[PDB]
Amino acid sequence: LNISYTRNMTLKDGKNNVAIAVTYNHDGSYSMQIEDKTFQVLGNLYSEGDCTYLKCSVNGVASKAKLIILENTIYLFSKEGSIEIDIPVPK
């Protein structure tokens, strides 16, 4: 009510911890601030066959990639690169 919710997330890219401030916009999009830079991200998940694909646009650049979340790890498979991101585990 009368304010915008901001969530603080932490992701371990290899050996480096990165903090992201995600602001939930009214129109369903997200505003992600990583360090100085800010990004407008909007996307969705659609399942074809047995594969779930994330179709997302970041700062007006659109892409799609197969998304698998397994055991505190996030795998994004695309036609230009494969990305593995580690979710921190609470103590």
Q: Which neighbouring-strand residues pair with 19?
A: 10
Q: Which of 70, 71, 68, 72 is nearest to 82 (CA)?
A: 68
C-alpha to C-alpha distance for 36 and 50, rounded to whole angstroms:
38
Residue closer to other proteins by CB (options 73, 78) is 73
Q: How far is the CB of 71 from other proteins (least distance, A)?
A: 10
How is residue 61 written in tokens?
């650049």
Nearer to other proteins, 22 or 58 (CB): 22
Nearest distance from C-beta of residue 43 to other proteins, angstroms: 14
Please report, as ranges, the residues that interact with other proteins according to CB under 8 A: 1-3, 5, 7-8, 24, 90-91
